[PDB]
Amino acid sequence: QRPERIKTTPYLEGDVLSSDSGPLLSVFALQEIMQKVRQVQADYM
């Protein structure tokens, strides 16, 4: 229904690899941020 998503040439058509959304990416970012600091504090006195 959006004119931006209309494809008329197979140049922009390709396979699908993965998917993601907001509720997954937010918790992923929080996990990575906390994991980094926990690892750093564990590796050194």
Partner: protein
């Protein structure tokens, strides 16, 4: 072709590059090529050529006439875009012509400006279907004959 290769300009057709090994040169020098069976499509090629040209001309005429509907009827086509009528025209063309064009459009990108330039070009291949299509559009110039009005 040759002066563009020296100057390094890529604004035209780019030749295809193939890779070979060193010993292949000697092997190719010691082997000649002798044709033993000519292609089965040599005598059929002109008919295919004419069919392809006629289908391209029909598509060009259809787009040329459909390009003015947005200006003619603002109320119905207020949120229309050129890709809409492009896709509409492509949905009625034969599959073979679309495949022939897709052989090149698979790895070369085109947009609305390229094909608008293509459809404004003055060249058509006359045929029965093309002439009847042009006359059909001329007859259907007035939408009142299509039985819809405001």
């Amino acid at each position: 072709l040759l002066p563009d290769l020296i100057a390094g300009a890529h604004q035209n057709a780019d030749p295809v590059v193939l890779d070979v090994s060193w010993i292949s040169l000697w092997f190719a020098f010691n082997r000649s090529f002798e044709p033993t069976h000519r292609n089965e499509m040599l005598e059929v090629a002109p008919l295919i050529e004419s069919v392809y040209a006629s289908e391209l001309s029909v598509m060009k005429v259809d787009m040329r006439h459909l390009s003015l509907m947005q200006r003619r009827f603002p109320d119905v086509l207020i949120q229309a875009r050129p890709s809409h009528f492009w896709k509409a025209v492509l949905n009625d063309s034969p599959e073979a012509v679309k495949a022939v064009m897709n052989l090149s459009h698979s790895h070369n990108f085109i947009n609305i400006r390229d094909m608008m330039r293509w459809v404004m070009l003055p060249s058509l291949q006359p045929s029965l279907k093309l002439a009847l299509e042009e006359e059909a559009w001329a007859a259907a110039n007035d939408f009142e004959d299509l039985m819809l009005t405001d």
